[PDB]
Amino acid sequence: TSTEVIAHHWAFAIFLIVAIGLCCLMLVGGWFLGGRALSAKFYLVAMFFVIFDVEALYLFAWSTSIRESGWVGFVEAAIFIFVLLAGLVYLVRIGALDWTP
Amino acid sequence: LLKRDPLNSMMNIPAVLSRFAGKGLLLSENGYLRWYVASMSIGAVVVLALLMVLR
Amino acid sequence: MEFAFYICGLIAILATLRVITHTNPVHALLYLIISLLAISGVFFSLGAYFAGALEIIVYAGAIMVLFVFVVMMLNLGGSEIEQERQWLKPQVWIGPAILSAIMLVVIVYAILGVNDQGIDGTPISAKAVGITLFGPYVLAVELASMLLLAGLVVAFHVGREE
Amino acid sequence: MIPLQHGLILAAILFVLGLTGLVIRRNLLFMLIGLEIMINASALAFVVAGSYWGQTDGQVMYILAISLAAAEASIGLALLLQLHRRRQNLNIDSVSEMRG
Amino acid sequence: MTITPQNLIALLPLLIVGLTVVVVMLSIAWRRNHFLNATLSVIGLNAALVSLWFVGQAGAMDVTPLMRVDGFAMLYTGLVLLASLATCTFAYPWLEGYNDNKDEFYLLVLIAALGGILLANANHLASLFLGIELISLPLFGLVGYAFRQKRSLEASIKYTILSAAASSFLLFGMALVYAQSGDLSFVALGKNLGDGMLNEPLLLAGFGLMIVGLGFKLSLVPFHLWTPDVYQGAPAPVSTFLATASKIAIFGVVMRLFLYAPVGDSEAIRVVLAIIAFASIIFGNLMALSQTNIKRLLGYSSISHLGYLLVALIALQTGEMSMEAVGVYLAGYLFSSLGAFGVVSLMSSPYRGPDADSLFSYRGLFWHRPILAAVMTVMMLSLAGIPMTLGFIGKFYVLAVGVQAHLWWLVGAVVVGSAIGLYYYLRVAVSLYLHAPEQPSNWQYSAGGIVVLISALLVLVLGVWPQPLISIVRLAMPLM
Numbered sequence A: 001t002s003t004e005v006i007a008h009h010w011a012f013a014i015f016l017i018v019a020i021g022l023c024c025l026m027l028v029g030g031w032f033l034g035g036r037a038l039s040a041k042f043y044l045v046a047m048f049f050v051i052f053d054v055e056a057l058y059l060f061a062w063s064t065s066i067r068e069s070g071w072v073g074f075v076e077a078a079i080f081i082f083v084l085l086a087g088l089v090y091l092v093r094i095g096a097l098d099w100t101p
Numbered sequence B: 001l002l003k004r005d006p007l008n009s010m011m012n013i014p015a016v017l018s019r020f021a022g023k024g025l026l027l028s029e030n031g032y033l034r035w036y037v038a039s040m041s042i043g044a045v046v047v048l049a050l051l052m053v054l055r
Numbered sequence C: 001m002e003f004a005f006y007i008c009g010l011i012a013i014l015a016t017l018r019v020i021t022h023t024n025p026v027h028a029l030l031y032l033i034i035s036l037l038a039i040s041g042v043f044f045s046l047g048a049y050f051a052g053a054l055e056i057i058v059y060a061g062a063i064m065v066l067f068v069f070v071v072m073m074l075n076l077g078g079s080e081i082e083q084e085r086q087w088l089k090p091q092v093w094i095g096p097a098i099l100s101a102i103m104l105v106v107i108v109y110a111i112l113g114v115n116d117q118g119i120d121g122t123p124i125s126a127k128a129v130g131i132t133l134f135g136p137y138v139l140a141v142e143l144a145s146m147l148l149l150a151g152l153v154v155a156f157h158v159g160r161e162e
Numbered sequence D: 001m002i003p004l005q006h007g008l009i010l011a012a013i014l015f016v017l018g019l020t021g022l023v024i025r026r027n028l029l030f031m032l033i034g035l036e037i038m039i040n041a042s043a044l045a046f047v048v049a050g051s052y053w054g055q056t057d058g059q060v061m062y063i064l065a066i067s068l069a070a071a072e073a074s075i076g077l078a079l080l081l082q083l084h085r086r087r088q089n090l091n092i093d094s095v096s097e098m099r100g
Numbered sequence E: 001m002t003i004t005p006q007n008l009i010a011l012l013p014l015l016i017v018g019l020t021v022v023v024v025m026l027s028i029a030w031r032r033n034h035f036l037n038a039t040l041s042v043i044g045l046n047a048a049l050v051s052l053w054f055v056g057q058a059g060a061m062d063v064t065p066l067m068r069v070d071g072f073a074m075l076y077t078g079l080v081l082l083a084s085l086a087t088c089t090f091a092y093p094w095l096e097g098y099n100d101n102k103d104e105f106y107l108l109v110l111i112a113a114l115g116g117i118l119l120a121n122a123n124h125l126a127s128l129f130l131g132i133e134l135i136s137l138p139l140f141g142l143v144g145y146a147f148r149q150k151r152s153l154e155a156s157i158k159y160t161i162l163s164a165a166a167s168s169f170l171l172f173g174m175a176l177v178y179a180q181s182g183d184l185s186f187v188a189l190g191k192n193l194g195d196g197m198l199n200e201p202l203l204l205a206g207f208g209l210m211i212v213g214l215g216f217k218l219s220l221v222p223f224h225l226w227t228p229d230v231y232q233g234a235p236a237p238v239s240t241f242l243a244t245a246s247k248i249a250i251f252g253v254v255m256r257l258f259l260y261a262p263v264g265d266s267e268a269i270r271v272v273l274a275i276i277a278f279a280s281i282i283f284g285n286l287m288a289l290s291q292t293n294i295k296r297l298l299g300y301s302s303i304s305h306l307g308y309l310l311v312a313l314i315a316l317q318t319g320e321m322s323m324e325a326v327g328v329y330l331a332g333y334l335f336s337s338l339g340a341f342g343v344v345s346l347m348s349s350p351y352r353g354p355d356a357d358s359l360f361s362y363r364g365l366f367w368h369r370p371i372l373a374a375v376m377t378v379m380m381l382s383l384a385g386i387p388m389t390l391g392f393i394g395k396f397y398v399l400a401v402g403v404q405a406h407l408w409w410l411v412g413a414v415v416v417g418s419a420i421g422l423y424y425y426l427r428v429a430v431s432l433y434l435h436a437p438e439q440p441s442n443w444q445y446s447a448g449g450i451v452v453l454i455s456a457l458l459v460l461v462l463g464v465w466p467q468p469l470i471s472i473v474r475l476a477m478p479l480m
């Protein structure tokens, strides 16, 4: 509730509003002005992205508190990353990530 | 009058009721997934309503 | 943070109500993305900053991308469902709407009458969530990695083309 | 200053709408969409409850919830693709062979 | 809390099964070999049993805010591991008939066993939810493992959609419970209440939605309609696992949740569970009356038997030996279901492809498979609660527990449902010995036959002499 935080909140709100309104006004001016006259590999790579993005979120949570977790948290995240990498190795070796078979 | 055992028949009628109730209950197993979801939601409504009534 | 919470909850409710009663899959997924962004704004209004960030990153940025991928690759151009619109017929939707309204009434009656000091909305950072995640919730993290591995293996076995 | 009742009521409304979408829609894709709405609503309810108590356990439950949501969306869309490539039909009432 | 080395000793089956998942997956990444990966999976599960012995040599303690290990957890871990080992043994000949990849099956069985172990030790709502999902998603894969077959794809879609909905119900109920009570541990659900205010409406609604999810998972009425379709459509080793390990693990975590929660001794929840148990017993037995399909029949049988288990759960907060009754009944039900579904699996193995039929055709099984017919009729007598079988010992435990707690409606329900079971189980067991007009040679098929034979012998011996099983279950007690 300080002056600086509410100033940055207003600045961020104005940034978002003016940005989206600038894009909207660009499209409105473009439209108004001027005269008139599949393969399953894509699913596989998207699903792999989803799974590895959730595991990436776990690592996102870990990375911001490494010093507070100590070496025990390092061991747990090392087991996590090892399971993650074993899954990646399995996907590569079975041809799931091989785009040209 | 008794040559076809009447007491045996009036003791057999629970088996008749059980067969009728089984045939009636087998109509819920129609194989439709939307009905299975609907029956789960109906059971959720019934369980929540019973818990709210009993308090 | 109060006005933001109420307007984002209103946007989320309206967007998912438009989701469940729409015929075009891409339009329905777009309204679902809008509802997810509104729910992320609700999360940010309550101080759950990590939850809102993950709502946009994962829910509105990975899962709905997978849904859009599937919709685009199956190419739904009105395969005997768009030309019917059976869910807009009263006999199909009126019953389940009554059932869902009864469930909502019972749940909301359960919500009311519970003591409430109010949500402070103070920011619970991602550092605290990370400390809890790799502190008292370690086995949850490891078995969640196993859960995502199970989902990966199942989805590869079922969804590969050959 | 935001009541717990209002956040839980919002989550309940979203859950009920997702369940209705799961029931009334005959297309399997919209059933998966309703499932995603339901699991996101339950995760929102956990976040609301965690923010009320000032505890980090609500966001941890959210993280587990969206891990489940991602993995089961992957599995459900794989099964949807299999149904599409085996029948050329996403009607969920057509896949009803086993009956009592 | 931090994990001391002793806590690592108490996590030994969980660690060994997770390491087996990693090792089997890396072996598949090396070379796709059916025999080596199946052998690695069964070696990992047997090592988890020996690790259970090592856990027993340690103490009973709370390894996390999430997990608590005790004799209760050890017993349920042993039951889940036995069911998973039997599932792998039954799966090898069936997968030998399969044409696509056949090692992801063992990977999924291992992950489902890991979820069963987590539910065996679960002391927290987070661990309960995660264990249910770790059971469920590999079963989504396993039920639709033969997805080119119409029935397996149908069962996979039904099970996936309904289990996702039930998980949403369970998670929303957990969220309402956490909204009421500020802690997610089992012992604190209803702790902040007193002076007759145990029936808080939000807590009861949360437990109701959790009951909806768990009663889907336990095939309890009215969340039971999925069971015969999924049991019939799934592969037969998958049906074995789904009947034994999933139900046993989920009922164990429900038992511990109702033992530890201060809201467990609630009159409203007890009455609702009594209604669900009554309806489950009567409806499962009545619907199994006119079934010619053996797998649908065993699905309705599972509904009724979980109703009997629920009757034993209702008397938990009043009597004492409800835990002992649940343990004895679950051992008997595990061995009977393993025998029945293993006979169904062995006669349907090797896999005949997605195009050929997979009907059991149990009529006249004695005249070409006499030993499997004897095992199947022993299992049919055991599921009927006939004396000289362990199923009767479990049924006797359920009746004694119900009589001690004055649950007279449930006692009468058990009697009536048992009579209906007598009819249809005897129909199957006597159709085994009639005459049918018309309608192997490897050691893994023989291993499956040895598994069903040992299950039959255990059922007979422990039906005649049940004192060793009672003595084993009685020393496997949780923290009071």
Ligand SMILES: CCCCCCCCCCCCCCCCCC(=O)OC[C@H](COP(=O)(O)OCCN)OC(=O)CCCCCCCCCCCCCCCCC
Pocket: A001, A002, A009, A013, C001, C002, C003, C004, C007, C008, C011, C034, C037, C038, C040, C041, C042, C044, C045, C046, C047, C121
């Ligand atoms: C306006 C009418 C409707 C018009 C159309 C829809 C436009 C979008 C409306 C919703 C989003 C904006 C709502 C208004 C937010 C204004 C800023 C605000 O309220 O800030 C307060 C608070 C700041 O945080 P804090 O530090 O806790 O504040 C207390 C100070 N000590 O803030 C917070 O704690 C969090 C603030 C909200 C979270 C960030 C923004 C989320 C945006 C979600 C968009 C969803 C999709 C919208 C689609 C629209 C078209 C259909």
Ligand SMILES: CCCCCCCCCCCCCCCCCC(=O)OC[C@H](COP(=O)(O)OCCN)OC(=O)CCCCCCCCCCCCCCCCC
Pocket: E049, E050, E052, E053, E056, E057, E058, E059, E060, E070, E071, E074, E075, E077, E078, E079, E082, E086, E331, E451, E454, E455, E468, E469, E472, E475, E476, E477
């Ligand atoms: C024969 C009758 C029927 C048997 C059916 C069994 C079915 C379930 C199988 C698993 C059951 C495990 C039950 C274990 C309960 C143990 C409870 C307990 O407190 O044990 C402690 C005890 C050590 O004693 P104590 O001094 O108290 O230890 C504390 C010291 N800090 O430590 C122990 O007691 C250690 C227990 C170790 C158990 C190892 C089991 C290995 C696997 C055996 C499988 C046999 C084949 C079965 C299948 C056949 C084919 C289908």
Ligand SMILES: CCCCCCCCCCCCCCCCCC(=O)OC[C@H](COP(=O)(O)OCCN)OC(=O)CCCCCCCCCCCCCCCCC
Pocket: E406, E408, E411, E412, E415, E416
């Ligand atoms: C279809 C077949 C199955 C039918 C359903 C199952 C049987 C239903 C029996 C209903 C019994 C109703 C009892 C009503 C009162 C209960 C509360 C009470 O005060 O009970 C009295 C007593 C416990 O009170 P207490 O002060 O401890 O006294 C001890 C000395 N009796 O209680 C006791 O001490 C124990 C009471 C035992 C009651 C009888 C149990 C045996 C039942 C025999 C077979 C069923 C009845 C006969 C056949 C009917 C047709 C099939």
Ligand SMILES: CCCCCCCCCCCCCCCCCC(=O)OC[C@H](COP(=O)(O)OCCN)OC(=O)CCCCCCCCCCCCCCCCC
Pocket: B011, B012, B014, B015, B016, B018, B019, E289, E415, E416, E419, E420, E423
């Ligand atoms: C005098 C009153 C006081 C004393 C009460 C004592 C109660 C216990 C002792 C009496 C029990 C009576 C049971 C009567 C039915 C016996 C079973 C029977 O008749 O089975 C044969 C029949 C199959 O033959 P069919 O009809 O040709 O085939 C149809 C299917 N294709 O099967 C069928 O049609 C289906 C059979 C279904 C299962 C059997 C029925 C169970 C019903 C509940 C049993 C408990 C009854 C409790 C008391 C009720 C009131 C007397």
Ligand SMILES: CCCCCCCCCCCCCCCCCCCC
Pocket: A070, A071, A072, A075, A076, A079, C138, C139, C142, C143, E003, E014, E015, E018
């Ligand atoms: C404070 C310094 C500590 C130094 C020693 C650290 C190593 C000892 C403690 C290790 C604990 C690791 C726990 C990992 C659990 C993994 C569970 C996986 C289940 C699938």
Ligand SMILES: CCCCCCCCCCCCCCCCCCCC
Pocket: E366, E374, E377, E378, E381, E388, E433
């Ligand atoms: C005590 C165990 C009871 C259950 C097992 C029953 C099976 C025992 C071993 C098989 C014996 C089968 C004999 C069949 C004879 C059929 C004769 C038909 C023509 C008269």
Ligand SMILES: CCCCCCCCCCCCCCCCCCCC
Pocket: E282, E408, E409, E411, E412, E413, E416
């Ligand atoms: C369709 C199958 C129906 C089966 C019904 C079985 C009913 C069995 C009889 C139950 C009788 C219960 C009597 C309870 C009396 C309690 C009195 C308490 C007084 C304090």
